[PDB]
Design an enzyme around this catalytic site. Structure first.
Site, PDB file in Angstrom:
ATOM      1  N   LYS A 106      -6.137   4.100   9.116  1.00  0.00           N
ATOM      2  CA  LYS A 106      -5.182   5.023   8.514  1.00  0.00           C
ATOM      3  C   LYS A 106      -5.718   6.443   8.518  1.00  0.00           C
ATOM      4  O   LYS A 106      -4.972   7.397   8.777  1.00  0.00           O
ATOM      5  CB  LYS A 106      -4.853   4.575   7.083  1.00  0.00           C
ATOM      6  CG  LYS A 106      -3.991   3.307   7.022  1.00  0.00           C
ATOM      7  CD  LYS A 106      -4.021   2.706   5.610  1.00  0.00           C
ATOM      8  CE  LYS A 106      -3.050   1.544   5.469  1.00  0.00           C
ATOM      9  NZ  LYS A 106      -3.175   0.970   4.098  1.00  0.00           N
TER      10      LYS A 106
ATOM     11  N   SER B 159       0.797  -1.231   0.000  1.00  0.00           N
ATOM     12  CA  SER B 159       0.000   0.000   0.000  1.00  0.00           C
ATOM     13  C   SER B 159       0.831   1.283   0.000  1.00  0.00           C
ATOM     14  O   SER B 159       0.250   2.367  -0.052  1.00  0.00           O
ATOM     15  CB  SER B 159      -0.951   0.032   1.204  1.00  0.00           C
ATOM     16  OG  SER B 159      -0.252   0.160   2.423  1.00  0.00           O
TER      17      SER B 159
HETATM   18  B1  BO2 Z   1      -0.014  -0.860   3.450  1.00  0.00           B
HETATM   19  O1  BO2 Z   1      -1.214  -1.019   4.237  1.00  0.00           O
HETATM   20  O2  BO2 Z   1       0.162  -2.039   2.653  1.00  0.00           O
HETATM   21  C1  BO2 Z   1       1.281  -0.486   4.331  1.00  0.00           C
HETATM   22  C2  BO2 Z   1       2.489  -0.108   3.451  1.00  0.00           C
HETATM   23  C3  BO2 Z   1       3.618   0.713   4.121  1.00  0.00           C
HETATM   24  C4  BO2 Z   1       3.152   2.132   4.492  1.00  0.00           C
HETATM   25  C5  BO2 Z   1       4.187   0.018   5.363  1.00  0.00           C
HETATM   26  N1  BO2 Z   1       1.682  -1.612   5.192  1.00  0.00           N
HETATM   27  C6  BO2 Z   1       1.086  -1.831   6.382  1.00  0.00           C
HETATM   28  O3  BO2 Z   1       0.210  -1.060   6.761  1.00  0.00           O
HETATM   29  C7  BO2 Z   1       1.506  -2.987   7.277  1.00  0.00           C
HETATM   30  C8  BO2 Z   1       0.360  -3.984   7.465  1.00  0.00           C
HETATM   31  C9  BO2 Z   1       0.261  -4.818   6.200  1.00  0.00           C
HETATM   32  C10 BO2 Z   1      -0.605  -4.437   5.192  1.00  0.00           C
HETATM   33  C11 BO2 Z   1      -0.708  -5.167   4.023  1.00  0.00           C
HETATM   34  C12 BO2 Z   1       0.060  -6.316   3.853  1.00  0.00           C
HETATM   35  C13 BO2 Z   1       0.944  -6.696   4.858  1.00  0.00           C
HETATM   36  C14 BO2 Z   1       1.045  -5.949   6.026  1.00  0.00           C
HETATM   37  N2  BO2 Z   1       1.859  -2.274   8.494  1.00  0.00           N
HETATM   38  C15 BO2 Z   1       3.153  -2.065   8.814  1.00  0.00           C
HETATM   39  O4  BO2 Z   1       4.041  -2.505   8.108  1.00  0.00           O
HETATM   40  C16 BO2 Z   1       3.484  -1.270  10.013  1.00  0.00           C
HETATM   41  C17 BO2 Z   1       2.461  -0.722  10.776  1.00  0.00           C
HETATM   42  N3  BO2 Z   1       2.752   0.035  11.817  1.00  0.00           N
HETATM   43  C18 BO2 Z   1       4.013   0.290  12.133  1.00  0.00           C
HETATM   44  C19 BO2 Z   1       5.034  -0.236  11.357  1.00  0.00           C
HETATM   45  N4  BO2 Z   1       4.754  -0.987  10.309  1.00  0.00           N
END
Ligand code: BO2
Length: 186
Positions: free
Chosen positions: A136, A93
């Protein structure tokens, strides 16, 4: 309530979540003039690393159409980092976020201030829906974000939030990266 008050060129605010809630984060990029290369850091999982590769390919093609004389994305050695350094991160994302950071860096132009975005990018620049929109958006609001860019197919999640959370947010529901470009670089 965030790491950057004003973002310099190559830095863009993204949005993440866990089971505990949403949070903001920043994609950082920098480059050195020596085909270019992209080095990625920040404890990124494989899916997120692939999204950086897609974003890099698409940003190169997008910049070639928009500014054919600008060779920064084709010849430079670029570094991309997502602090904090010890925190594991994953997911597709931040694709749009990464495209924007690379274009911001290559053009030497900061993105609009108080902007955050989330959205998976396909190889042709389509913006695909993501999870955690409710979390978010709450996190963006708490961080003082006033302009938020979301996939058009996540409208339903946005309107599941109470009105007092989303009121007066400049919200952009997008389907193609070029719409994001016009918002980030007016
Ligand atoms: B997005 O939702 O895919 C996002 C991308 C980027 C901004 C880190 N990743 C996340 O929100 C992930 C959860 C996830 C979503 C989709 C697939 C796998 C995992 N969160 C995190 O990586 C995260 C959240 N809070 C603090 C640190 N890292």
């Amino acid at each position: 309530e965030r790491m950057y008050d004003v973002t310099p060129p190559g830095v863009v605010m993204g949005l993440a979540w866990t089971a505990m809630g949403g949070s903001t984060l920043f994609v950082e990029t920098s480059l050195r003039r020596p085909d270019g290369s992209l080095e990625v850091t920040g404890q990124l999982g494989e899916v997120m690393k692939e999204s950086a590769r897609i974003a890099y390919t698409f940003a190169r093609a997008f910049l070639m159409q928009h500014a054919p004389a600008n060779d920064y994305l084709v010849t430079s050695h670029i570094h991309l980092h997502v602090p904090e350094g010890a925190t594991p991160k994953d997911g597709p994302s931040a694709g749009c976020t990464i495209v924007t950071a690379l274009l911001s860096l290559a053009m030497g132009r900061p993105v609009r201030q108080n902007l955050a975005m989330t959205g998976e990018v396909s190889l042709t620049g389509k913006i695909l829906p993501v999870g955690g929109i409710k979390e978010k958006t709450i996190a963006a609001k708490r961080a003082g974000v006033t302009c938020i860019v979301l996939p058009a197919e996540n409208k339903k999640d946005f309107y599941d939030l109470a009105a007092f959370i989303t009121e007066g947010l400049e919200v952009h529901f997008v389907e193609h990266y070029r719409e994001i470009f016009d918002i980030a670089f007016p």
